[PDB]
Structure 1
Amino acid sequence: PTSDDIFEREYKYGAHNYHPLPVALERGKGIYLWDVEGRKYFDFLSSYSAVNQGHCHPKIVNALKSQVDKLTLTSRAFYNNVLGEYEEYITKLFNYHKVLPMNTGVEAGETACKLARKWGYTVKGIQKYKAKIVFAAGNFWGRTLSAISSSTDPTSYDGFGPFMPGFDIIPYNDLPALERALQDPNVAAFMVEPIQGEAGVVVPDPGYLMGVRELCTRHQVLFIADEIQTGLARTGRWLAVDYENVRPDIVLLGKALSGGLYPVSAVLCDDDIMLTIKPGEHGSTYGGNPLGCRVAIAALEVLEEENLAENADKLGIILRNELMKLPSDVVTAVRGKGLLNAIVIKETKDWDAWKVCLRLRDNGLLAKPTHGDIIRFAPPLVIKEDELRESIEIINKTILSF
Structure 2
Amino acid sequence: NPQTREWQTLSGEHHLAPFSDYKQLKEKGPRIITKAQGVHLWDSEGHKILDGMAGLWCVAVGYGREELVQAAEKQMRELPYYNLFFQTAHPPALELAKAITDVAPKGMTHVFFTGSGSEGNDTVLRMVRHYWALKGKPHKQTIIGRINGYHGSTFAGACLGGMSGMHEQGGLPIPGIVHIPQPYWFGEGGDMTPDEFGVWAAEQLEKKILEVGEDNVAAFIAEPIQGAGGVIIPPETYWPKVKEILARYDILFVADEVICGFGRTGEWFGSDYYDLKPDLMTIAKGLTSGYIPMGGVIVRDTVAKVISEGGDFNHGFTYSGHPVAAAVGLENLRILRDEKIVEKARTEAAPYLQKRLRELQDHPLVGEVRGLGMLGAIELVKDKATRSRYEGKGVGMICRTFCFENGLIMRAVGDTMIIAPPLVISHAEIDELVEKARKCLDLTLEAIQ
For normalisation by structure 2, the TM-score amounts to: 0.84
2:107 matched to 1:80?
no
Contact kept? 1:213, 1:223, Cα under 8 Å? no
User: What number of residue pairs does the alignment pair up?
Assistant: 399
Give the equivalent residue in structure 1 for 2:425: 383
Deviations 1:28-78 (A, max 9, x none): 112010111222110011122110111232221121111111112111122
Residue identity opposite 1:166 in structure 2: G
Deviation at 1:307, TM superposition (A): 2.3
**What is the distance in 1 between the residues matched to 2:317 and 2:247?**
31
> Which residue of 155, 172, 192 maps to 2:165?
155
Flag the 1:22–1:375 CA change in 2: closer, same or farther, 3 A.
farther
Deviations 1:298-345 (A, max 9, x none): 111121123222333343333333333333530112122111111122
Match of 1:38 in 2: 46
Q: Which has the higher contact order (CA 8 A, sep 6+)?
A: 1
1:21-170 alignment, distance < 5 Å: 22-76=30-84, 77=86, 78-94=88-104, 95=106, 96-123=108-135, 125-126=136-137, 128-170=138-180
SS in 1 for 2:411: coil
Contact 1:134 1:169 in 2 (8 A): yes
Change (3 A) 1:280 1:324: closer
What's the CA shift string for 1:261-303, capped at 9, x where partnerless? 2121121122331242633511110001211111110111121
Tell me, yes or no, if structure 1 residue 332 matches structure 2 residue 367.
Answer: yes
Alignment RMSD (CA, Å): 2.0
Give, in whole Å, the separation in 2 of the partners of 1:2 and 1:375. Answer: 32
Q: Please tell me whether residue 282 in structure 1 is matched to residue 292 in structure 2.
A: no
- Mark the runs of 5 or more structure 2 residues left unpaired by the alignment: 184-200, 382-388
Structure 2: which amino acid aligns with 1:272?
Answer: T
Distance 1:163 1:322 in 2: 44
Note the alpha carbon deviations across 1:62-105, whole angstroms, 9 max, x for none.
Answer: 21111111112111122222222212222223142211111100
| Cα distance, 1:325–1:22 mapped onto 2, change above 3 Å | farther
Question: Among 217, 230, 246, which residue is 2:276 paired with?
Answer: 246
Q: How many Å apart are 1:386 and its aligned residue?
A: 1.3
Three-state SS of the structure 2 residue aligned to 1:369 is: strand
The one-letter code sitting in structure 2 at the alignment partner of 1:67 is Q
Which 5+ residue runs of structure 1 have no aligned equivalent? none
| Equivalent in the alignment of 2:206 | 179
Aligned residue among 405, 416, 425 for 1:362: 405
Structure 1 residues 159 and 181, CA gap change in structure 2 (3 angstroms) = same
Distance in 2, Cα, partners of 1:177 & 1:381: 34
Task: Specify the SS of the correspondent of 1:286.
Answer: coil
User: Cα deviations across residues 187-223 of structure 1 (Å, max 9, x unaligned)?
Assistant: 1110000100011000111142233233222202111
Pair 1:381–1:160, CA change in 2 (3 A): same
Q: TM-score scaled by structure 1? A: 0.93
Structure 1 Cα separation of the partners of residues 263 and 257 of structure 2: 10
Whether the 8 Å CA contact 1:333–1:343 is kept in 2: the answer is yes
Any conservation in 2 of the 1:130–1:166 contact (CA below 8 Å)?
no
CA distance in 1, matches of 2:92, 2:421: 31
Distance in 2 (CA, whole Å) between partners of 1:41 and 1:213 is: 42
Preserved contact between residue 203 and residue 241 of structure 2 (Cα < 8 Å): no
Measure the CA separation in 2 of the matches of 1:363 and 1:266: 36
